[PDB]
Each structure stands twice: as structure tokens, then as C-alpha cells.
Amino acid sequence: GGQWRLQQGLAANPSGYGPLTELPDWSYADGRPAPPMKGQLRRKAERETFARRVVLLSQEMDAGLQAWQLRQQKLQEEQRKQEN
Amino acid sequence: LRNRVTDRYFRIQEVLKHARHFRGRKNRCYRLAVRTVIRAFVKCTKARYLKKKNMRTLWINRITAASQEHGLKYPALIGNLVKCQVELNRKVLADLAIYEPKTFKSLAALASRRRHEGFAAALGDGKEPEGIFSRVVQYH
Amino acid sequence: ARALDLLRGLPRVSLANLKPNPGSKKPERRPRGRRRGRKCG
Amino acid sequence: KVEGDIWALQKDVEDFLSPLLGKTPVTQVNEVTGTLRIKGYFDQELKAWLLEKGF
Amino acid sequence: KFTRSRIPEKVFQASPEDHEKYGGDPQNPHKLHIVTRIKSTRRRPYWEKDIIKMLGLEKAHTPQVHKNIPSVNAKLKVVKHLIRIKPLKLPQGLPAEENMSNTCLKSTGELVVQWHLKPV
Amino acid sequence: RGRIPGRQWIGKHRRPRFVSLRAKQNMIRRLEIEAENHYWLSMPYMTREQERGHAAVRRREAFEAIKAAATSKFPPHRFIADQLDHLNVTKKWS
Amino acid sequence: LTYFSARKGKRKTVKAVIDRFLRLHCGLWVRRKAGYKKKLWKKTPARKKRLREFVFCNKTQSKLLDKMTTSFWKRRNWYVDDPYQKYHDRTNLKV
RNA sequence: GAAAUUGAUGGCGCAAUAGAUAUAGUACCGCAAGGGAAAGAUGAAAAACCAAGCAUAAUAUAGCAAGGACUAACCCCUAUACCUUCUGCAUAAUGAAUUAACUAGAAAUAACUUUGCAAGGAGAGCCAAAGCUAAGACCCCCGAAACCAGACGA
RNA sequence: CCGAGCCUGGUGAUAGCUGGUUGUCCAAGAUAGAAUCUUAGUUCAACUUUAAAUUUGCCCACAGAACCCUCUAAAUCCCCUU
RNA sequence: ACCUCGGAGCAGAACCCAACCUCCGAGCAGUACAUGCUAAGACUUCACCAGUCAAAGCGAACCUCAAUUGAUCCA
Ligand SMILES: Nc1nc2c(ncn2[C@@H]2O[C@H](COP(=O)(O)OP(=O)(O)OP(=O)(O)O)[C@@H](O)[C@H]2O)c(=O)[nH]1
Ligand SMILES: [Mg+2]
Ligand SMILES: [Mg+2]
Ligand SMILES: [Mg+2]
Ligand SMILES: [Mg+2]
Ligand SMILES: [Mg+2]
Ligand SMILES: [Mg+2]
Ligand SMILES: [Mg+2]
Ligand SMILES: [Mg+2]
Ligand SMILES: [Mg+2]
Ligand SMILES: [Mg+2]
Ligand SMILES: [Mg+2]
Ligand SMILES: [Mg+2]
Ligand SMILES: [Mg+2]
Ligand SMILES: [Mg+2]
């Protein structure tokens, strides 16, 4: 029943993101945390790359908009300057 | 005959050992044993997908049996357990049905409870208070 | 030299230690097996 | 015909050629044969440089 | 002959009814698309295969973030029948370098910058 | 009795095929997804003029990296240590 | 051609290639255009000028001619006054 | 396809389907020319466990004969032999009873890789505007009806 | 076993034709046509493989690519950005 | 019956496209005698062969045509 999970905002697959999978599978009886699971490390790396790309794309689009605004300015005050 | 093969006995045996449990000459003659053994190995490789599929089918059948014993249908039980947010898989559900009948009865009662809560919500559609079990724990 | 010191450290050079310089002897391709057999190219 | 620290020779060649080429040249240090191979033609420049070094 | 399809421009002109239905204001449009390949490129033209490869949607059900700019939109229009496009939402804003390692893309399309895996 | 001439699904006289409610629902679901795709593509963020050249620097740097990788292809180094290590094959005890 | 001659065991040269083509030491093969002496009365002056020219060959044609001629024909020839002396080497050629 | 000219002590072999055809040109076959085999294994002295095929031990519903399995051989579920050829073969297209043995990729040009030397290389000759020298590494098996020469045959 | 005997030899005749072409493992890999006594084949293209050098390759914004013809298609070419 | 070449549809719009598909044609003729010589850069009948256009320059004056043809050797 993935549609209900999607409606609730969880992953359609319970094996996706969530405590059931992203939490450590085990820990030492003494209480010491276990070394990170290989799948969890790979997933964290993938999410980090995704977030970095999100930031890069947003920054590039913002910089492009700012550059376009600056170019429109340059054009406007130029036009005015050689009009005067 | 400068160079001659001296291991042909062992090369043949490497296949005849896997062919020993066949029928007829397929377990004795290499010309036949090799073909039969290749087919057997291909079947063994392809049989893992079928093993998983048949395991899931058997689990679904047993869960259906237990749910019918308790008056529920398998789709209702599975969907309502998911809605209750109990993520027991089909293997574990069948194991509980076989070996923990009282626990499976409790799970079926929970599934029917959630099903009736959903029916009540649909019937009295609106902003009526959410069902007690219908409430979903939120993780962040 | 460091190479000669390494020789001093290493076992004796004999006819059981000789090896051609890697890349000097290309493997010989002959028509036996699945990949190079059948129609043999 | 290189004798000694072929790796030091490689470092010196890279330092000498990077300004000319614009980027660090790609090279192979054949330690066994005592030779240094550099991608691109630099025979005249390297000959003059080695003459300056005094070899 | 079967050829590349030119989608008329009126198809991609949203109406107020569409805005109400899909919850997106024409002003202040979303910056980034989350695109997931939900359809196989097999049995589809080589140009659609190439566009999918260009967009980096080779793996199905693997979200990819893309700019909401006219050229990327043109490619997405070319391969729109094989992909699901949603707007990337940033409830807590863009992730910072401090929280870059704690992000998660929820199924709703929100890139939460804190992922504690704990009950609310 | 009840033969389909020749091969099913290809000839002039093909075996009839009928759409089930399941198939209709699947196609409708896909159509809904594509309609939402149309909606979300109908709202560009920047215009073509605004986007012009906003990623040129990054694209050029990426291609420069590709060119550097292509032009750095050159045979690997060779080491006297690697050559002499083969003498160890006859390493023995005393 | 004859890959191994019955008397010497050597590779032989197809003398038609020698009679028809010129090899420049750089690896280029020069040839005359076919029909440059045929039916000139019906050919326009531009066509005659094109046909009266010495012409190079494809890479594949050059390779074929190299295969069909032995190494003796690919040597460096220091003839006294060779009209093609300057054409035996390439200059300012990149790749 | 020249010539002038130049100068010049055994086995990284086979070991009885191999190596000679050969234990023998014998047996056998053919009027004749001619064709042409097979094989043997003790010991210092004889004056001393393994191929196929079967038997031990015929067979039980169902099916490319197996696989997943299973407490359990079978029963359950899945599974349209192989090779070649072809657009496409379970194909009712070819080959194959089966075991053992034998049975089929030879090499120049030009390049590539690795050494050596280097405006020179090579142990005369040859090549050379970084080349030359050395090595490595690519080129199958069986099959016609035929043609011609000389013998042998009424 | 005579449309022209048989044997030996040239002879391992030749066959664009059929058949066969024997260890393991990984990887890339199905692409227009032209000529040919040629369409059962081959050579060149195209595709494909390997290695090497270099820098642009694909997608593609406007603008642009004919009248004949009264109307006249899906499209295409070119093509910065991305 | 056909075999080579050109034009038009099929093939409506860059190019290219089969057919023992539909239709037309060609195997010249005319004029000129610089219808001479050279030479950048391009096109190209999907290869090659072959076939095309052509700036500038010299020398002068002050080609039409869709096809209208055929290599090598040898004479
Ligand atoms: N290569 C080779 N060497 C042989 C052969 N037969 C004999 N020899 C050599 O002849 C040499 C002398 O042979 P022996 O039998 O010792 O003496 P021998 O009888 O006086 O020799 P011969 O005069 O050769 O008959 C040895 O070096 C043998 O190896 C042969 O067939 N080939
Ligand atoms: Mg293969
Ligand atoms: Mg039928
Ligand atoms: Mg002589
Ligand atoms: Mg014998
Ligand atoms: Mg036995
Ligand atoms: Mg049968
Ligand atoms: Mg059969
Ligand atoms: Mg047949
Ligand atoms: Mg039979
Ligand atoms: Mg008589
Ligand atoms: Mg007779
Ligand atoms: Mg033969
Ligand atoms: Mg592969
Ligand atoms: Mg062309």
C-alpha cells in the first residue's frame, strides 16, 4: 500500500527513507554505537550530492538573474548618458 | 603426438560428478551428461527468482487462510496493517499465523478496527475527529 | 646505487628468476574456447 | 641517458616546461631504463636547458 | 512517417483552474524541478533516449534536480511522457554547508534540511 | 474450432484484443501524471534572455576538465622496485 | 600479389602500380587523372585543365599501393634534378 | 623475373590409432597395373581400484527427465535437448547410438608494445629529414563431378 | 558402378557451395549505399573494434532555406543558450 | 521486356531514397575560334573512378544546351 504512504508523506516503499531503514540495525551490548552501515553511508553521500547540486543550481540561477538585471541597468543608464 | 591431453579423465569427472544423480545414460556418458548438467545449472540459476516468488505466494496464501479464519480478507488485512503503520512483512505475518495464533488474531482485530475507522471517516466525511488507531505517528 | 643495494638485499639472480619486460611479450591468441573458437574470427 | 635521481630530473623538467607549455607537462619516468619521456616536441628547448645545466 | 512531435505552445499555458488544482501560483514560479523517470526508454525513439541520457534520468524512480529554465523545459517537453515533474520545495530554505549532510528529499517533494529519524 | 488465420496479432485477421478496466485505469493514471507535468512545465522561472550565458563559465570549466583528462592520457611510470621484486619468487629460508 | 616468390621467398611488387603511380617519400601517391588523353575535342577547357593535373590518392588507396609495392619503392631517392624533390616531405602538417 | 658485381656433431623428434605402410609390401583384395592391413606388453628367474556395455539390483500415474525443494525417491510448482543454418527452429530443417583415441589458423606489408643505440642504426648489402636494430603478436580441416600423362586390361 | 574403362601420378587438383572448426572469464559490438558475367561472392563506402592526438560532439532560441501551384502535411535543415 | 545518361512525380518543406512503378526524353545540334594559359576556395550523384563551379593573376578583347557519353591497355 504505497499510495497511503505517499499521502502521509512517507516513502511509497517502506524500504525507502525513514527510521525503519536509516536507523542503525544494531549496536554493541555495551551501548557503543555500531559503525555506519554501508548502505546508509552510500545514501548519505547521495543525499549530500543532491543537496550540493540543489545549492549549485539555485545559486547559478540567482547569479544569472542578477547579471541580467545588471546588464539591463547598464543598458538603461548608457542609453540615458548618450541621450544627454 | 608431441602434446597430448592427460587430464581428460578429470575434465570428464568434473561434469560426471554433477551428473551422477541423473537418470539413464545422462549420468554416465559425457556427451549427454554435459548437456544435462548445463541445463541443470541454468535451471538452478533461474530458480532463485522463482524461489522468491513462490515464497511470497505461499506467504500470501497462508495469510489469506488465517485472515479468512478471522473473517478478514488478505487485501483488507495487509492494507489496514499498513495504515496502522505496522510494517510486518508477509513472511513474518505467515510465521505469526502458523505459530502465534493469538498474536495473529490481535493483528487481524487491529486491521478490522482500522478498516472500520476508515469506513466511519468516509461515511462521515468532513472534519470529524480522526480514529484513535487511524492517527499516524510523524517522523522527522 | 639504490638499485644495486636492492639487488644485494634480494635473492640471487638465476635462470629461475628471469622475466621478460612487461609489454614486450604480447599473449598469443589461438582459436580455442568460447570467445576465440567456433568460427575462429 | 639519465643516471641518478630520474625523479629529480622529472621535477626539474616539469618546472622548466610548465611556463612554456602553460600547464604541467605529462611525462613518464622509466626508472628501469633511466629515461624520461615528455608528451610534445621539446627537443631543442631541452637540449639548450641541459647545456645550461652543464651536462 | 513517424517524426518528432511539435507540441503546440497553448498546451503549456496554465489556466486558473489548473493553478487551483495543482497548487502553484503563476507569479513566483518554482526554481527547480524534481524529475523521475517513470517510463522505460525502450520502444521509444532514439532522440528521446538521448534526451533522457542528457537529463541524467537513466535510472527509473531516481529523482534528479534540474533548473526551471526554458532550455531544460524544452528537453522535458520532448521527454515529458516518460517522466514525472514536480516542484522542489524548500520549507527550511536552501541547505547550508552546516546542514548539507542532513538533507533528505521526502516523497512530497520537500528537501528538509534536518533529518533526525525521530518522532515529532 | 475457433482458429485465428496465420499468426495472432499481425495479420489482416488478428485475434481480437479488448481493453480491460485495469488497462483503462492505468492509462488514465498515466494521463493524469502527464497533465500535471504539463502544468509544472508551463511556468518557467527565467526567460531565454535571462538564462542566456548564466552557466557558460561552468560548462566551459567542465569541458576543460574533459579536455585535460583526454590529453593527459600517457603511458604509466615504470619502477626498478617493480622490476626487481620479481627476484623474490625464488626467496627461500636458511 | 605474390606474398612469397617461389625463387627468393620475398614479397613481389605489382609493376602496374610502378608504371601508373608515383610515391612521395612522405607517404603520398601521385597519379594522373583517367581520360586525360581521351576525347579532348568534346571536353571543355576547364575539364582539360582538371585532367592535365597530377593528383594525390586516398588513405585507403595509398595503403593499397604501399601493400602492392615493396620497400625498395619507399626508399629515399636523391635524384639529380627531381621535379618532385620538394614534394617528398610535408611541412607545417598537424596530425 | 635476371645478370654484371659481392663473397661462401646429435634431437625443447614419435613411443603401438603416434613414428616408416610395415611384426609386411606379408595376410587379404583385384585378371592385371595396383591397393593394402591389424597387432605386443608377467617376472631376476616359468628348470618359480578406472570408459562405454552389462550383473549385483526390472518396473508405479505425469511427460527434454532437471531445478526449487522437501521429513520424504516420486507426488507439488517452474522449465519447448544440443549443434549448424536462418528473417525466424521444440521444430515434423541438418548431424549425432554411445565410450576411448585421433581429428582442423601456417605468413608477409604497414602499424602497435617493449629493449638497445641514436643523426645515426645494423656483425658489408639496407634504411634514415628520429631513425634504425631486435623481439612479441593476425591469416584453418574434410568433401566433388572433373582435366591431363603413363601403365594395365578382349 | 562406361555420354566413355581401371590403376598410378600431377594431387593436399579446384570448389564464391555444404559441413566442421576443440580451455576459463570480462568488455565493445546489428547503420545508409556504389560498382561488379554481379546480386549464394567480392572491393570501396557506412557501421563496428582497438590505440593515439586534439577540441569541440549531441540537445538546440531567434533569424534564415522558391517560384512553378489557387490551396497544399507530419516534419526537416541551420542553430547560440542550456 | 530491360541493362548507360537526364527531367517530373512517388519523395508537398536541407539532402538522400525502391520498384519487371507512373510519364517524358538523350546518344545531338548550333555559335564561336582567347571555345587561351594559369590559380585561391569550394561542390560532388552517397566509396573510388569520374564529374562540377570559380575569385585573383597573365594574355586578350573593350559559349548556348538537362542528358547529348566510354576508363585502362593497345593501336
Ligand atoms: N648429428 C649426428 N651425429 C652423429 C650421427 N651418428 C653419429 N654421430 C656422431 O658421430 C660421432 C662419433 O660417433 P661414434 O659412434 O662415437 O664413433 P664412430 O663410429 O667413429 O663415428 P662415425 O665415424 O661418425 O661413424 C659422435 O659425435 C656422434 O654423436 C648422426 O646420425 N647425427
Ligand atoms: Mg563471442
Ligand atoms: Mg497460426
Ligand atoms: Mg651472379
Ligand atoms: Mg603404425
Ligand atoms: Mg563402467
Ligand atoms: Mg518428434
Ligand atoms: Mg530435428
Ligand atoms: Mg538443408
Ligand atoms: Mg538420422
Ligand atoms: Mg575371347
Ligand atoms: Mg567396369
Ligand atoms: Mg579444398
Ligand atoms: Mg556487452
Ligand atoms: Mg562524394
Q: What is the DSSP letter of G29?
A: E
Chains D and A make contact, 3+ CB pairs within 8 Å: no
DSSP E strand stretches across G1-95: 22-23, 29-32, 54-55
Q: What is the DSSP letter of A10?
A: S
* Ligand 12 center–CA G81 separation, angstroms: 77
Q: How many CA atoms lie within 13 A of B78 on its CB side?
A: 17
Chains C and E make contact, 3+ CB pairs within 8 Å: no
Q: Using CA atoms, how far apart are residues F32 and C29, in angstroms rounded to an integer?
A: 58
Q: From the CA of E68, how many Å to the nearest CA of chain F?
A: 5
Q: How far: E41 CA to H91 C1' (Å)?
A: 34
Radius of gyration of chain E (CA): 17
Three cell numbers written together for A27: 549496536
Four-CA torsion G72, G73, G75, G78, nearest 10 degrees: 120
Inter-axis angle of helices B90-99 and B30-69, nearest 10: 70
Say yes or no for a CB contact (<8 Å) between F41 and E73. yes
Q: Using CA atoms, how far apart are residues A8 and B137, in angstroms rounded to an integer?
A: 10
Say yes or no for a CB contact (<8 Å) between A8 and B136. yes
Nucleotides in chain J with any atom closer than 7 Å to protein CB: 35-39, 48-54, 63, 68-72
Q: What residue in B sits closest to A8 (Cα-Cα)?
A: B136
State the CB neighbour count (10 A cutoff) for residue E82: 24
Q: How far: E8 CA to J41 C1' (Å)?
A: 44
| Burial category of G75 from C-beta neighbours within 10 Å (exposed 0-12, middle 13-18, buried 19 and up) | exposed
Sole residue written with cell 513566483: E28
CA distances from F24 to B8, B75, D3, F27, F34 (A): 62, 22, 80, 5, 15
* Ligand 11 center–CA D49 separation, angstroms: 108
Say yes or no for a CB contact (<8 Å) between F78 and D33. yes
Establish whether the CB of E50 is closer than 7 Å to any nucleic acid atom in strand I: yes
Cβ(F66)–Cβ(A73) below 8 Å: no
Q: Using CA atoms, how far apart are residues G33 and G46, in angstroms rounded to an integer?
A: 14
Phi-psi region of D40 (alpha: psi -120 to 50; beta: other; left: phi over 0): left
- The letter for the amino acid at G6 is A
Cβ(G31)–Cβ(G21) below 8 Å: yes
Three cell numbers written together for F62: 567542465
Q: Which residues on chain E are in Cβ contact (under 8 Å) with B137?
A: 119-120
* Ligand 8 center–CA C10 separation, angstroms: 65
Which H or E run includes D27? strand D27-30
Q: What is the DSSP letter of F15?
A: P
| Of B57, B54, B75, B62, the residue nearest B101 (C-alpha) | B62
CA distances from A53 to E28, E60, E119 (A): 21, 19, 29
Four-CA torsion G74, G77, G82, G83, nearest 10 degrees: 20
- What distance lies between CA F35 and its chain's CA centroid? 25
Q: Which residues on chain F are in Cβ contact (under 8 Å) with E26?
A: 43
Buried b (16+ CB within 10 A) or exposed e, F34-70: bebbbbbbbbbbbeeebbbebbeeeeeeeeeeeeeee
Q: What is the DSSP letter of E101?
A: G
3-class secondary-structure state, position F17: coil
Sole residue written with cell 571536353: G43
Q: Using CA atoms, how far apart are residues F84 and D32, in angstroms rounded to an integer?
A: 9
Three cell numbers written together for G4: 612469397
Cβ(C32)–Cβ(B3) below 8 Å: no
Q: Using CA atoms, how far apart are residues G18 and G72, in angstroms rounded to an integer?
A: 11
Establish whether the CB of F71 is closer than 7 Å to any nucleic acid atom in strand I: yes
**Given the DSSP bridges, would you call strands G29-32 and G54-55 parallel, antiparallel or unpaired?**
antiparallel
Q: Angle F85-F86-F88 (CA atoms, 0-180°, nearest 5)?
A: 75
Say yes or no for a CB contact (<8 Å) between F77 and D31. yes
Q: How far: G13 CA to J75 C1' (Å)?
A: 28
